[PDB]
Design brief:
Helix content: over 70%
Keywords: Plasmid conjugation, Plasmid partition, Helix-Turn-Helix, DNA binding protein
Oligomer: monomer
PDB class: dna binding protein
Radius of gyration: 15 Å
Number of helices: 4
Structural class: mainly alpha
Assembly: monomeric
Strand content: under 5%
Entry title: DNA binding domain of partition protein StbA of plasmid R388
Name: StbA
């Protein structure tokens, strides 16, 4: 009776937290390449082809947060 959609959501909570953490670890190198002229959309495409369902807004959020913490 429990939908496979709710079941799948629950099953992927912890996997997604791990991916979120992996994405934060990538931010220093992403920031370097992106300020050198690599497009945000290009990195988002690579992420979306390899298990990270982030959109452009969410990607920029992580990038902005990395940058604030870095400047501090």
């Amino acid at each position: 009776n429990e939908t496979d959609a709710l079941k799948d959501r629950i099953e992927n909570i912890r996997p997604r937290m791990t991916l979120a953490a992996k994405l934060r670890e990538l931010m220093p190198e992403i920031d370097r390449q992106v300020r050198a002229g690599v497009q945000h959309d290009d990195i988002v495409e690579t992420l979306n082809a390899n298990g990270f369902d982030v959109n452009l807004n969410t990607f920029r959020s992580y990038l902005y947060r990395y940058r604030k913490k870095a400047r501090a």
